[PDB]
């Protein structure tokens, strides 16, 4: 991309891999990662030949969510989580996206992956919707997509308590996602993308449009509710203390 | 035996009726004879309120194989069109609880027909697939509604988009809510469960089932009209 | 009093149901004491997490035999003394640490908690239909809501008994532990919850459960409608007389 922290590779004629590789920030949503992700998805939107997208990280990190400075900015009231929308990239994509989460998925980074149509976790990586550890309520559509993908009950615990779970922990709690050794996750994503690429692209886009119509319809109102909750929770001095203390 | 002798009704006791699909020529694909005999079997059940539980099941290694190969080809090549049909929703429309004892493979519309049952039992060794997209077509027969409803939104996306084949053992490891057993144990477990259902007053079974599946019965027609439109949007 | 209130650390409140005579069935005393325990929590804005739990081998045993016979005769209805929604109506997160058996309305009351823990050795059942009547107490809403549509169908229609270990293998999203570990794990989760600001726990829980709170009243009316059709038959009175405690 421009900032070189996203690499696009056309794996086959109809499969595009979006690899996040902001090594300086461990795939946290730095300004560079934020700009390069939006540019990668726009590229995919401008080039309607692909049948599947693989979204993945580097080494041990899938995506680590807001930077410390990003979160402090929202605490200060300078910015809101909706300012740059990275959470809904894979939902807004017209073709199926596979979030190959071979490494850790933290906060916004985990939630961005959960909006993909197929999610794969690594057994030995850590996944957390850790918003509430810092004193504020989950944003980035976490309160809609977590129950939608992992189910109402596990979502309560994940969102209220902001705990960290190994992929193996989630596998044992019964999640519908494929969970694999980290070394196998991207290979499995490629094979699944090859299978998807056996279909006509128009059938994949028509089908996904139908399957995720209710998510696209329902998400704006939840985003407005989460912004309301941020109004009521984010701006407290103790949120600043927790971000600085516990990040 | 129903008219064409490809569905057999067997009273297990008093109050339990087994509907056994056995179109061996077509491996329980939706031939004309199986379509007719299935509709005739569920009409018989509706006319005979002595039953409290139904067990729908196949023969040997086949539960139900969905569209015939000839039928699918004729659609693919424009000789015919996808219609709406009774079959997928027979178990939902039935007044009393239906157990789909899927002791054999459930393919396409065959799988989907089983999923509309109130209780679904799979076989570990069998293959289950919503394979519509392998033919190039978007899924019909209410698949886009009933697969997310029974197997959850996330696994439904994979099943429906990729049209892959899952062994029962694979789905069991993925976390499905259905009992998964060896094939040789599927029908006996279904008869045990039907016996326990038949301990209940029939009016309470029916009253409860009406309430639990009301949202499915209410929402399904709109989804069918949506699936019909997707077929139009993917045929020039 | 058959409920004891124990403070744990600074802000965790344990509600322990201890009606030993009735094995935590909804006796008049348990009913009144539970209602008052949650009113006490409602009036105390110190607490951040509730642990609702039973004693020894019992979490909660559901309607007493006389309680069921009183609805059968049409003297009462399940909606008369609302225990079913106690955890849902509580403004802070509630953990149902079901270290013992959860039977009928006692299981359903527990399922309304934000976090549910089962015990491997214990028995859980929505057993309404065993007595011939349809499930009340919000069970047709909360069972599919917590355990998913498909498993809820089998649980509610068939009124079967499941060990915690059986539910664990069928794939439930709740943590299932040996009985002797259930309460200790709930305490550790409650300590983790107590790390957050109370206003963030309340704000978030209000949002997450708003759909339950909004939708529950319509389903309770529907369940009353079903009880009008099913509860008041002689064979229900025979089954309650003959099958209660099996």
mmCIF file of C-alpha atoms in Angstrom, chain B residues 44-220:
data_model
loop_
_atom_site.group_PDB
_atom_site.id
_atom_site.type_symbol
_atom_site.label_atom_id
_atom_site.label_comp_id
_atom_site.label_asym_id
_atom_site.label_seq_id
_atom_site.Cartn_x
_atom_site.Cartn_y
_atom_site.Cartn_z
ATOM 1 C CA UNK B 44 -51.787 -39.270 6.329
ATOM 2 C CA UNK B 45 -50.208 -38.077 9.571
ATOM 3 C CA UNK B 46 -52.229 -34.871 9.524
ATOM 4 C CA UNK B 47 -55.460 -36.907 8.996
ATOM 5 C CA UNK B 48 -54.576 -39.353 11.842
ATOM 6 C CA UNK B 49 -54.168 -37.512 15.096
ATOM 7 C CA UNK B 50 -53.434 -40.664 17.055
ATOM 8 C CA UNK B 51 -49.675 -39.942 16.674
ATOM 9 C CA UNK B 52 -47.675 -37.864 19.059
ATOM 10 C CA UNK B 53 -44.187 -38.108 17.439
ATOM 11 C CA UNK B 54 -42.889 -38.680 13.905
ATOM 12 C CA UNK B 55 -39.455 -40.220 12.998
ATOM 13 C CA UNK B 56 -38.339 -39.288 9.483
ATOM 14 C CA UNK B 57 -35.456 -41.475 8.267
ATOM 15 C CA UNK B 58 -33.837 -42.998 5.135
ATOM 16 C CA UNK B 59 -32.555 -46.497 4.334
ATOM 17 C CA UNK B 60 -28.966 -47.921 4.613
ATOM 18 C CA UNK B 61 -26.481 -45.111 4.131
ATOM 19 C CA UNK B 62 -28.928 -42.462 2.699
ATOM 20 C CA UNK B 63 -31.187 -40.079 4.520
ATOM 21 C CA UNK B 64 -32.158 -37.829 1.554
ATOM 22 C CA UNK B 65 -30.092 -36.687 -1.457
ATOM 23 C CA UNK B 66 -32.018 -33.549 -2.554
ATOM 24 C CA UNK B 67 -32.553 -32.525 -6.230
ATOM 25 C CA UNK B 68 -32.110 -35.290 -8.808
ATOM 26 C CA UNK B 69 -28.984 -34.925 -11.030
ATOM 27 C CA UNK B 70 -31.274 -34.750 -14.109
ATOM 28 C CA UNK B 71 -33.378 -32.062 -12.481
ATOM 29 C CA UNK B 72 -30.392 -29.886 -11.584
ATOM 30 C CA UNK B 73 -28.941 -30.213 -15.056
ATOM 31 C CA UNK B 74 -32.201 -29.108 -16.622
ATOM 32 C CA UNK B 75 -32.176 -25.934 -14.548
ATOM 33 C CA UNK B 76 -28.463 -25.273 -15.223
ATOM 34 C CA UNK B 77 -29.176 -25.547 -18.952
ATOM 35 C CA UNK B 78 -32.336 -23.478 -19.058
ATOM 36 C CA UNK B 79 -34.679 -26.299 -19.994
ATOM 37 C CA UNK B 80 -36.604 -25.689 -16.696
ATOM 38 C CA UNK B 81 -36.827 -23.180 -13.755
ATOM 39 C CA UNK B 82 -36.484 -23.610 -9.970
ATOM 40 C CA UNK B 83 -39.956 -23.829 -8.558
ATOM 41 C CA UNK B 84 -41.197 -23.593 -5.026
ATOM 42 C CA UNK B 85 -42.209 -27.033 -3.546
ATOM 43 C CA UNK B 86 -43.828 -28.613 -0.536
ATOM 44 C CA UNK B 87 -41.047 -30.871 0.459
ATOM 45 C CA UNK B 88 -38.511 -28.862 2.480
ATOM 46 C CA UNK B 89 -41.050 -27.728 4.984
ATOM 47 C CA UNK B 90 -42.969 -31.037 5.605
ATOM 48 C CA UNK B 91 -41.579 -31.364 9.133
ATOM 49 C CA UNK B 92 -42.225 -27.707 10.047
ATOM 50 C CA UNK B 93 -45.840 -27.871 8.748
ATOM 51 C CA UNK B 94 -46.450 -31.157 10.659
ATOM 52 C CA UNK B 95 -48.579 -30.531 13.812
ATOM 53 C CA UNK B 96 -46.631 -32.889 16.113
ATOM 54 C CA UNK B 97 -42.867 -33.115 16.851
ATOM 55 C CA UNK B 98 -40.745 -34.632 14.076
ATOM 56 C CA UNK B 99 -37.316 -36.227 14.715
ATOM 57 C CA UNK B 100 -35.101 -36.324 11.676
ATOM 58 C CA UNK B 101 -33.069 -39.499 12.249
ATOM 59 C CA UNK B 102 -30.444 -38.744 9.580
ATOM 60 C CA UNK B 103 -28.693 -42.146 9.763
ATOM 61 C CA UNK B 104 -27.338 -41.592 6.205
ATOM 62 C CA UNK B 105 -26.112 -38.805 3.959
ATOM 63 C CA UNK B 106 -28.175 -35.566 3.820
ATOM 64 C CA UNK B 107 -27.391 -33.684 0.584
ATOM 65 C CA UNK B 108 -28.782 -30.297 -0.563
ATOM 66 C CA UNK B 109 -32.574 -30.138 -0.292
ATOM 67 C CA UNK B 110 -32.349 -33.487 1.538
ATOM 68 C CA UNK B 111 -30.268 -31.993 4.335
ATOM 69 C CA UNK B 112 -32.457 -28.887 4.472
ATOM 70 C CA UNK B 113 -35.616 -31.039 4.760
ATOM 71 C CA UNK B 114 -34.144 -32.774 7.780
ATOM 72 C CA UNK B 115 -33.105 -29.442 9.399
ATOM 73 C CA UNK B 116 -36.759 -28.279 9.454
ATOM 74 C CA UNK B 117 -37.448 -31.114 11.919
ATOM 75 C CA UNK B 118 -37.863 -30.309 15.657
ATOM 76 C CA UNK B 119 -35.059 -32.687 16.694
ATOM 77 C CA UNK B 120 -32.204 -33.577 14.261
ATOM 78 C CA UNK B 121 -29.829 -36.601 14.899
ATOM 79 C CA UNK B 122 -26.806 -37.065 12.633
ATOM 80 C CA UNK B 123 -24.636 -40.052 11.851
ATOM 81 C CA UNK B 124 -20.900 -39.641 12.488
ATOM 82 C CA UNK B 125 -19.909 -41.448 9.202
ATOM 83 C CA UNK B 126 -22.351 -39.684 6.923
ATOM 84 C CA UNK B 127 -21.906 -36.675 4.683
ATOM 85 C CA UNK B 128 -23.994 -33.544 5.110
ATOM 86 C CA UNK B 129 -23.908 -30.620 2.662
ATOM 87 C CA UNK B 130 -25.870 -27.647 1.595
ATOM 88 C CA UNK B 131 -24.308 -28.035 -1.847
ATOM 89 C CA UNK B 132 -26.492 -25.708 -3.986
ATOM 90 C CA UNK B 133 -23.583 -23.320 -4.788
ATOM 91 C CA UNK B 134 -21.563 -26.257 -6.211
ATOM 92 C CA UNK B 135 -24.108 -26.225 -9.096
ATOM 93 C CA UNK B 136 -23.548 -22.488 -9.473
ATOM 94 C CA UNK B 137 -26.937 -21.634 -7.968
ATOM 95 C CA UNK B 138 -27.772 -19.734 -4.736
ATOM 96 C CA UNK B 139 -29.375 -21.962 -2.098
ATOM 97 C CA UNK B 140 -33.100 -22.641 -2.202
ATOM 98 C CA UNK B 141 -35.745 -24.623 -0.245
ATOM 99 C CA UNK B 142 -35.417 -22.282 2.721
ATOM 100 C CA UNK B 143 -31.686 -23.264 3.257
ATOM 101 C CA UNK B 144 -30.680 -19.603 3.808
ATOM 102 C CA UNK B 145 -33.197 -19.420 6.680
ATOM 103 C CA UNK B 146 -33.098 -22.866 8.337
ATOM 104 C CA UNK B 147 -29.289 -23.414 8.274
ATOM 105 C CA UNK B 148 -28.536 -20.243 10.290
ATOM 106 C CA UNK B 149 -31.606 -20.934 12.504
ATOM 107 C CA UNK B 150 -30.458 -24.504 13.470
ATOM 108 C CA UNK B 151 -26.609 -24.349 13.126
ATOM 109 C CA UNK B 152 -26.056 -20.639 13.953
ATOM 110 C CA UNK B 153 -25.157 -17.640 11.882
ATOM 111 C CA UNK B 154 -21.429 -18.150 11.668
ATOM 112 C CA UNK B 155 -21.260 -21.830 10.639
ATOM 113 C CA UNK B 156 -24.206 -21.219 8.263
ATOM 114 C CA UNK B 157 -22.080 -18.624 6.285
ATOM 115 C CA UNK B 158 -19.423 -21.295 5.630
ATOM 116 C CA UNK B 159 -21.919 -24.040 4.862
ATOM 117 C CA UNK B 160 -24.005 -21.993 2.445
ATOM 118 C CA UNK B 161 -21.278 -19.973 0.688
ATOM 119 C CA UNK B 162 -18.806 -22.826 0.211
ATOM 120 C CA UNK B 163 -21.287 -25.684 -0.204
ATOM 121 C CA UNK B 164 -18.726 -28.066 1.336
ATOM 122 C CA UNK B 165 -19.321 -31.667 2.490
ATOM 123 C CA UNK B 166 -19.042 -32.260 6.218
ATOM 124 C CA UNK B 167 -18.964 -35.649 7.873
ATOM 125 C CA UNK B 168 -21.225 -35.856 10.902
ATOM 126 C CA UNK B 169 -18.020 -36.226 12.902
ATOM 127 C CA UNK B 170 -16.729 -32.925 11.420
ATOM 128 C CA UNK B 171 -19.928 -31.047 12.459
ATOM 129 C CA UNK B 172 -19.788 -32.660 15.912
ATOM 130 C CA UNK B 173 -16.179 -31.286 16.327
ATOM 131 C CA UNK B 174 -17.331 -27.890 15.064
ATOM 132 C CA UNK B 175 -19.828 -27.574 17.903
ATOM 133 C CA UNK B 176 -23.368 -28.361 16.528
ATOM 134 C CA UNK B 177 -26.379 -28.722 18.961
ATOM 135 C CA UNK B 178 -27.507 -31.981 17.373
ATOM 136 C CA UNK B 179 -26.811 -35.387 18.857
ATOM 137 C CA UNK B 180 -24.203 -37.102 16.551
ATOM 138 C CA UNK B 181 -24.012 -40.957 16.826
ATOM 139 C CA UNK B 182 -22.708 -43.860 14.854
ATOM 140 C CA UNK B 183 -25.062 -44.698 12.062
ATOM 141 C CA UNK B 184 -25.999 -48.056 13.637
ATOM 142 C CA UNK B 185 -27.272 -46.192 16.785
ATOM 143 C CA UNK B 186 -29.224 -43.263 15.092
ATOM 144 C CA UNK B 187 -32.602 -44.922 14.605
ATOM 145 C CA UNK B 188 -32.659 -46.635 18.042
ATOM 146 C CA UNK B 189 -31.848 -43.326 19.733
ATOM 147 C CA UNK B 190 -34.637 -41.633 17.706
ATOM 148 C CA UNK B 191 -37.159 -44.333 18.832
ATOM 149 C CA UNK B 192 -36.104 -43.815 22.487
ATOM 150 C CA UNK B 193 -36.613 -40.081 22.180
ATOM 151 C CA UNK B 194 -39.982 -40.550 20.401
ATOM 152 C CA UNK B 195 -41.069 -42.824 23.265
ATOM 153 C CA UNK B 196 -40.251 -40.117 25.781
ATOM 154 C CA UNK B 197 -42.121 -37.491 23.738
ATOM 155 C CA UNK B 198 -45.167 -39.795 23.562
ATOM 156 C CA UNK B 199 -45.391 -39.719 27.372
ATOM 157 C CA UNK B 200 -46.730 -36.137 27.053
ATOM 158 C CA UNK B 201 -50.406 -35.167 26.372
ATOM 159 C CA UNK B 202 -50.703 -34.624 22.610
ATOM 160 C CA UNK B 203 -52.431 -31.255 23.091
ATOM 161 C CA UNK B 204 -49.424 -30.014 25.152
ATOM 162 C CA UNK B 205 -46.917 -31.248 22.439
ATOM 163 C CA UNK B 206 -48.900 -29.460 19.720
ATOM 164 C CA UNK B 207 -49.521 -26.243 21.784
ATOM 165 C CA UNK B 208 -45.807 -26.022 22.590
ATOM 166 C CA UNK B 209 -44.551 -26.840 19.108
ATOM 167 C CA UNK B 210 -46.957 -24.231 17.598
ATOM 168 C CA UNK B 211 -45.480 -21.620 19.931
ATOM 169 C CA UNK B 212 -41.808 -22.608 19.482
ATOM 170 C CA UNK B 213 -41.882 -22.712 15.670
ATOM 171 C CA UNK B 214 -44.321 -19.799 15.127
ATOM 172 C CA UNK B 215 -41.452 -17.454 14.155
ATOM 173 C CA UNK B 216 -40.204 -20.031 11.603
ATOM 174 C CA UNK B 217 -43.633 -20.573 10.057
ATOM 175 C CA UNK B 218 -44.161 -16.760 10.007
ATOM 176 C CA UNK B 219 -40.765 -15.746 8.544
ATOM 177 C CA UNK B 220 -40.147 -18.592 6.047
#
